[PDB]
Amino acid sequence: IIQEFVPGKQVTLAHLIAHPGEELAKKIGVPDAGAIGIMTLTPGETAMIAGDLALKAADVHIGFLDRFSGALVIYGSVGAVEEALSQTVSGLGRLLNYTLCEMTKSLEH
Amino acid sequence: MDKERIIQEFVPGKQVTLAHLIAHPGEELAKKIGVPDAGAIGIMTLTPGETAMIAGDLALKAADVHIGFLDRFSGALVIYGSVGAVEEALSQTVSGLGRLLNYTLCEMTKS
Amino acid sequence: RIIQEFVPGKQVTLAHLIAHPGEELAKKIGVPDAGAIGIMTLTPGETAMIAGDLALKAADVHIGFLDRFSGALVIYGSVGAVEEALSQTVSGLGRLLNYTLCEMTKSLE
Amino acid sequence: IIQEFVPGKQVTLAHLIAHPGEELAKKIGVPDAGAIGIMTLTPGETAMIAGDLALKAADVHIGFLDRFSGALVIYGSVGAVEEALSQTVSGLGRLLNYTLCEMTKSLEH
Amino acid sequence: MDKERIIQEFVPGKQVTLAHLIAHPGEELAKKIGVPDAGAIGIMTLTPGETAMIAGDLALKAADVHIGFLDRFSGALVIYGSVGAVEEALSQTVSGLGRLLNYTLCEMTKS
Amino acid sequence: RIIQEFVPGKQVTLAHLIAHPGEELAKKIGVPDAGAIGIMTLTPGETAMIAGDLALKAADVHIGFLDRFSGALVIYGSVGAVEEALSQTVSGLGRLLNYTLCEMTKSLE
Ligand SMILES: [Cl-]
Numbered sequence A, D: 001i002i003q004e005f006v007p008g009k010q011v012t013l014a015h016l017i018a019h020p021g022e023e024l025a026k027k028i029g030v031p032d033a034g035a036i037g038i039m040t041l042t043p044g045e046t047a048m049i050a051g052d053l054a055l056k057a058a059d060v061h062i063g064f065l066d067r068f069s070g071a072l073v074i075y076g077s078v079g080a081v082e083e084a085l086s087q088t089v090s091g092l093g094r095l096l097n098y099t100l101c102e103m104t105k106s107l108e109h
Numbered sequence B, E: 001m002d003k004e005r006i007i008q009e010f011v012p013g014k015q016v017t018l019a020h021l022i023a024h025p026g027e028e029l030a031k032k033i034g035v036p037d038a039g040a041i042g043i044m045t046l047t048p049g050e051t052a053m054i055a056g057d058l059a060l061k062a063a064d065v066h067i068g069f070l071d072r073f074s075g076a077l078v079i080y081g082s083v084g085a086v087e088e089a090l091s092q093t094v095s096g097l098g099r100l101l102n103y104t105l106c107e108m109t110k111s
Numbered sequence C, F: 001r002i003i004q005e006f007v008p009g010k011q012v013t014l015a016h017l018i019a020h021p022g023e024e025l026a027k028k029i030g031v032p033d034a035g036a037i038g039i040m041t042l043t044p045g046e047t048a049m050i051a052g053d054l055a056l057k058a059a060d061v062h063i064g065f066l067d068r069f070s071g072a073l074v075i076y077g078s079v080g081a082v083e084e085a086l087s088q089t090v091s092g093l094g095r096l097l098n099y100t101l102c103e104m105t106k107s108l109e
C-alpha cells in the first residue's frame, strides 16, 4: 500500500567542538574561533528559527545556516557556544515541541 | 549478500509543520536567511512542498507582507514585514489551508 | 535489511462540493458567484491538469484555479454540473490512471 | 531500525489530453494545442532525458520540463503527442530499464 | 479515528541512479533544461543529493566539460560540452565515485 | 494505516584505510604523497566536520578533503596515525553521538 509521509520535528544533534583549529575552520569557511557548534534540524527550515534562538542566547555568530539540510553552524568562545547550543535546543522544545537530543562535546586537544 | 531492493510508493501528507514568527531577527540573521531586515520574518514548512505557492498567495492577500522566498520543492515559505503583518499573514495562511484545502495544521508559534 | 526504492503514489485526497457558496465565500476563494464550487487536491501535484480536463469534459464547469505544480483544482458552475464534474473526475482518475480515491464530500449552508 | 532509501526509476504516468482547450492551456502556460501530453518521472532528472526522446520522436514541442517534480509536458497535434508519449515511455524502458506505465488518453469532447 | 503517527529514521543510500549522455540535444531542449546548446548534455542523479558537488569536481577534472548546474539538495548534476568530453566525464565520475567512495553505480547510458 | 514522520538517521557508511597509496594515487585523490590516506563517508552530510575534528584530535593527521555539506572526509598521515584517527573517529561517533557504524576496511598494495 501507499505510505504517507510528513517531516518530523527533530533536533538530530547539537554538538560543541572546542578549538577546532585553522585547518578545519578553513575547510568549512567559518572563522577560526574558540568553538564551533553544529546542529542538524528537521524540517530544514528550522535552521532559520534556531539561528534566531542561538544569536539571542549568547555572544555567538552564525558560521552558516542552511535551510536545505537544516544545518546551523555557530561560532564564538567555548562558553558562549555551549550556552547558545543549550538554549537553542531547550527553546525548540519549549516553543515548538521538538524531539530533542543530548548536548554533546568534543574537548580541546 | 547485497541488500534486497523493494519499490515502495509514497505520498506526501497535507500538513503545515511550522508557522513561526521570528520577531526582531536582527541584521546578521536577516542576511544569513537572505531577506531584508524587517520587524519580523515568518517561516512556514508545507507538505506537499508545492503548497508553498498557494501559501504565499494566501499570505500576500492577508496582510502587508513580502515574499522573502518561496520554494515549491522543499516546501519553504519565508515572508517578512512588520510583526503585526507577519502574524496576521501566518495566521490567515494556516487558517485558509485548513478551511479550504483540508490541511492538517500546526499552532502559530512566536519567538 | 532492505533498500527502499522510492516512487510517487497517485492519490486524490480531497473532492469537495460547496453548494451555493454565496457572494462573500466566492470572493474569498477567487471565483464568480456561482451555484457551486468544487475543490480537489491530488498528487503528484503536476497532474492537476489531468483532473481539470476530466472536469471540463464531464460537465459545464469552469476552472477557477489550476496551475502547473500545486496539485489543487478549483472549479465552479451549477450544483449539478460541479457534482457531475467531481464524480466523473474522481471515477476517471481511478479507472484510467489507478489513483487511490477519497470519498466525495459536500457542504451546504 | 534505520531505513535506507534511494530513488526508483519509474514512469508514473504518460497521459494524452486531446483538445484541452483555451481555458486549461492558459492556466498551465502551454499553447492551446491539439493535444497536451503529460508524463511524471522519477528521479526528477529523467524529465531532461524524456524531453530529448519526445522531441526526436515526433513533431511536438515542450510546454515545460521540470527537473524537480519530474514533470514533462509536451504539445502538438493529437497524433504527434500520442507518438511522442509512446516512444518516450518505450525508450526509457529500452535505454534505462525504467518501470513503465500504460499510455492513457482523454478523448476530445 | 486519525491515522497514528510514527517517527521513522531514514538514511540515503550511496547510489548513482542516472549517468546519461544526451547527444545532440538541440536548441529547444537546451533552453528548457537551461544550459547552452552544446554537442551533448550529461545528466546524473546522485544519492545522497549532496554528492553532486564531488561529482561535479570529478567531471571537470576528467574532461573539457562545463557545469550546467549542480544541485546538492535534489542530487542533480548537469554538464555540457562535446559528445566525447561529456562521455569521458560521465564515465570517470561514475568510476571515481565507485572506486574512491564505494558508491553503487549505474550503467553509462546514451541517447 | 500510519503517517510516517521522517527524520534523518546518523550513520558512518565508509571508514577506509589506504596504506601507502603512492605518488600516482595520492595525486589522483588530491593529497600529499603520505604514508596513508583515510576515507570516511557519513550522514547527515554536514556532520563531516564532527568527524574531521575527532580525527585531528586523535592523531597526527591532516585533512585532505572536507567541506560543509558533502559527508565525505579524507585524511592523510602515517599509517599508524591514519589508523588511530579512523578508529577513534568511528568509535567516537558511535559513543558520543549514537551513529550506526560500519566496519573499518583497509587496502595495502
Ligand atoms: Cl572566538
Ligand SMILES: [Cl-]
Residues within 6 Å of the ligand: D032, D033, D034, D035, D075, D076, D077
Ligand atoms: Cl497543435
